[PDB]
Design a protein around this ligand. Sequence first.
Ligand code: AP5
Ligand code: ZN
Length: 216
Amino acid sequence: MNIVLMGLPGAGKGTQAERIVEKYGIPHISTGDMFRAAMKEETPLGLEAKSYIDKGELVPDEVTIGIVRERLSKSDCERGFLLDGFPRTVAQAEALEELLEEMGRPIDYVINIQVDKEELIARLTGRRICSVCGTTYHLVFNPPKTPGICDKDGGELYQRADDNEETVTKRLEVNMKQTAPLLAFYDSKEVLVNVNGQQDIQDVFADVKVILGGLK
Ligand SMILES: Nc1ncnc2c1ncn2[C@@H]1O[C@H](COP(=O)(O)OP(=O)(O)OP(=O)(O)OP(=O)(O)OP(=O)(O)OC[C@H]2O[C@@H](n3cnc4c(N)ncnc43)[C@H](O)[C@@H]2O)[C@@H](O)[C@H]1O
Ligand SMILES: [Zn+2]
């Protein structure tokens, strides 16, 4: 099961990836996670990515492709894999198509999670993450028992640095522009499948399961 999740910022890719992971046991390769790890450790790759991430811009293709190429250089990815947030440009997708052809591991499905932009903005600006355990909540859609605090550990919830309104607006603008031709690319390859992301989490995942059930 060689799967790409795509969707505009806030579409719920990470939420669905966690479920896909737990059910099918394929590795979750998240560029967003990998960049945030590098940023937090202040590595040279981290500091390079940060200038872009903090503005809501894409990290250049050169470094991104190269970190993904080799993440996929691993024995855990022979089962299959779940790419979350890569590719997000046609040039990324074309690099990935080549690499995977050579690797014998071409993409089965690209699952595109579709959510109205108004809701996307609400999802991102209202997201709150536990500073203690990393659990994600949402002010409206999945609120804590006590506002501002994690149910599990009493930890303070915070808003991610790139989830303020102005950075969200930039992130949507950047990704809307790149998503248009990327979807055309994967549709021409006949691997694109759309899913309605504006359902409860369990129902979105139910639709994902129908798609992937055939690849168990
Ligand atoms: N390939 C690449 N090339 C270049 N640069 C790259 C790159 N990949 C990354 N980058 C760089 O790294 C940066 C960060 O990357 P990235 O994190 O990949 O940005 P993303 O696509 O903007 O959107 P998020 O990933 O923030 O959210 P998500 O869609 O996973 O949503 P979640 O599941 O949390 O859910 C969102 C919220 O909604 C809630 N929620 C989720 N599902 C539902 C639902 N079904 N109903 C109600 N609420 C829900 C959640 O609780 C949560 O509060 C990029 O901006 C770019 O700078
Ligand atoms: Zn917590």
